[PDB]
Write a protein that binds this DNA or RNA. Structure first.
Ligand SMILES: Nc1ccn([C@@H]2O[C@H](COP(=O)(O)OP(=O)(O)OP(=O)(O)O)[C@@H](O)[C@H]2O)c(=O)n1
Ligand SMILES: [Ca+2]
Ligand SMILES: [K+]
Length: 430
DNA sequence: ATGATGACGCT
DNA sequence: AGCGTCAT
């Protein structure tokens, strides 16, 4: 009862750019705006692989990982933009730079955790407290939340989407206790007003639209963000959790989309997150380990403590390329040449990073996949990264991997390589 | 023949 | 260290 923590101590948001690479290419090329369009990498094999899809193209069934030639079967008018290719590999620099535009706007409002090229978590607790003092108890207008959905409302005793949105928002605001400055529901609402402001600024200053979730922790914020996409934000209160989780497949919760989530389902014989509440913490720890069991016990009640880490820059900087099918690398010369190509792009990004961010990497990790290995990495070895020089870095990578060559011939490479990966890690300030 | 990254857990 | 998991 009175001692039972409810995980309502923080306001956390997750911001996710809608069809990010598509928005970048549509900003650059107005002919792509408001059209079914997709972003593709490479082109010779089956038209290239689709990596991002506009909402207009998704209505036709186009998805990520589709070959562009197949996507054109679903959507003959599909417009395509191609990822830059440099040194024979995809080069994502345009999207990384657009991402920096967005993250630097977000950092004005609060400290952010870069979660991916196009997602950041925001810890808003402190900004909320401040804005609450600026309010002095005045009600929060629905005009301050023009794109906000309150998950689970409307409820109780119109047939259009926006009318539903406004109805739920009104019920929520009508029930708010704007007098109590430590009300969790009030704090989430203020958090949502701030996130509206953040999203307005991102759109004004970059042209890019995003969705967001606002809740009390990262898992609920991420789940919230996915509930109303694109160009909308969703508030998931602590009170909404029982109904939301009662039909929510377990695999939808961040970190449960893989083998652990499958084993939760199979060992416990359940399907939905809320069903987890019927097990004791010790039962869950017995099945899934002490850490996982504690996490699941708290999470299925809507409680999570993973902090928004203050980290706006990636921790490692890497370059990778796959060599599928008949293109697998089968000679010494081939392996060396592609290691040089990867290392040249890596040198370029590292030099940029050292100038921009005042740091230097100190370890080089070299990862390969061999033909027939189902695993995504067959081997990983490290060496010292002492100078930002592509020829040295590629020579060192070759050195640390060369005894993997089975061939008795000095010039051949067996088994052939289906993946090369260079990653610079262990950054020190400079 | 999805392909390009990136973080973190386990041992 | 080196591998496995999960994600965007
Ligand atoms: N299997 C995946 C999924 C995502 N990404 C990377 O993560 C970025 C954002 O992924 P995601 O948010 O899932 O896709 P969006 O295009 O942004 O679509 P949405 O509107 O649903 O956010 C992609 O552009 C891509 O760079 C990737 O490389 N491989
Ligand atoms: Ca996105
Ligand atoms: K994303």
């Amino acid at each position: 009862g009175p001692h039972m923590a409810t995980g309502q101590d923080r306001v956390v948001a997750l911001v996710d750019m809608d069809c990010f690479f598509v928005q970048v290419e549509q900003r650059q090329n107005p002919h792509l705006r408001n059209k079914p369009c997709a972003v593709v990498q490479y082109k010779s094999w089956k038209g290239g692989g689709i990596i991002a899809v506009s909402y207009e193209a998704r209505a036709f069934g186009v998805t990520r990982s589709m070959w562009a030639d197949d996507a054109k079967k679903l959507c003959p008018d599909l417009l395509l933009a191609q990822v830059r290719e440099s040194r024979g590999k995809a080069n994502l620099t345009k999207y990384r730079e657009a991402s920096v535009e967005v993250m630097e706007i977000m950092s004005r409002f609060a400290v952010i955790e870069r979660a991916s090229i196009d997602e950041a978590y925001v810890d808003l607790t402190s900004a909320v407290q401040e804005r609450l003092q600026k309010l002095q108890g005045q009600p929060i207008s629905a005009d301050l939340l023009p794109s906000t959905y309150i998950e689970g409302l409307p409820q109780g005793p119109t047939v259009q989407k926006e009318g539903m949105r406004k109805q739920g928002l009104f019920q929520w605001l009508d029930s708010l206790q704007i007098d109590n400055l430590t009300s969790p529901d009030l704090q989430l609402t203020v958090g949502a007003v701030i996130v509206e402001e953040m999203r307005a600024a991102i759109e004004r200053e970059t042209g890019f639209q995003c969705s967001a979730g606002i809740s009390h922790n990262k898992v609920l914020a991420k789940l919230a963000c996915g509930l109303n996409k694109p160009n909308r934000q969703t508030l998931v209160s602590h009170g909404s959790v029982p109904q939301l989780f009662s039909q929510m497949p377990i695999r939808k919760i961040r970190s449960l989309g893989g083998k652990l989530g499958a084993s939760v389902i199979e060992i416990l014989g359940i399907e939905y997150m809320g069903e987890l509440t019927q097990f004791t913490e010790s039962q869950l720890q017995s099945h899934f380990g002490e850490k996982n069991g504690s996490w699941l016990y708290a999470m299925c009640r809507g409680i999570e403590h993973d902090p928004v880490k203050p980290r706006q820059l990636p921790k490692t900087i890497g370059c990778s390329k796959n060599f599928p099918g008949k293109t697998a690398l089968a000679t010494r010369e081939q392996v060396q040449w592609w290691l040089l190509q990867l290392a040249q792009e890596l040198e370029e990004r590292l030099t940029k990073d050292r100038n921009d961010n005042d740091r230097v990497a100190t370890q080089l990790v070299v990862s390969i996949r061999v033909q027939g290995d189902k695993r995504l990495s067959s081997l990983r070895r490290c060496c010292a990264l002492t100078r930002y020089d592509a020829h040295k870095m590629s020579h060192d990578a070759f050195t640390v991997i060369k005894n993997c060559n089975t061939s008795g011939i000095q010039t051949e490479w067996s088994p052939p390589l289906t993946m090369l990966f260079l990653c610079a890690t262990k950054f020190s300030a400079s």
